[PDB]
């Protein structure tokens, strides 16, 4: 995965843990290749294979 | 047009005046119906028909 911080425009959940990507900006990281969305705290918890 | 503030993820220009939508967040307003992107200052300058 190529995770880069993303500022989300509508409520998006973390594809790893299920909770909302909280906040007004920079709520989480979206993988540039597959679109997976994770919380900053959940990025270390995701498997590496994209 | 239904313009709402948008936080852009890559350099986007104003569809009205041609300059970059400056800034890290809330750089401009994107029309929810047609995707037109404008600077906060250019919204008053756009024609109403979408
Ligand atoms: C139109 C729109 O929903 O814009 C927003 C709303 O104002 C806001 C209530 C929002 O929908 C938000 C998007 C995300 C992402 O997960 C997170 C939130 O801010 C959030 O924590 C809650 C509880 C609602 C989410 C985005 C933005 C642009 C801040
Ligand atoms: C990957 C990426 O380009 O992210 C960014 C870059 O860090 C940054 C240099 C950027 O590309 C930016 C998007 C826009 C919109 O017009 C405005 C800018 O911040 C800007 O003023 C300049 C001079 C580059 C633009 C977005 C974000 C997410 C802040
Ligand atoms: Zn991926
Ligand atoms: Zn999570
Ligand atoms: Zn429009
Ligand atoms: Zn403009």
From Swiss-Prot, chains A, B:
It comes from the Eukaryota. A zinc finger (Phorbol-ester/DAG-type) spans 1-50. This is Protein kinase C delta type regulatory subunit. It comes from Mus musculus (Mouse). The gene is Prkcd.
């Amino acid at each position: 995965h190529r995770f880069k911080v993303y500022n989300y425009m509508s409520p998006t959940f973390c594809d790893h843990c299920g909770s909302l990507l909280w906040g007004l900006v920079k709520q989480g990281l979206k993988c540039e290749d597959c679109g997976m969305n994770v919380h900053h705290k959940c990025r270390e918890k995701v498997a590496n294979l994209c």
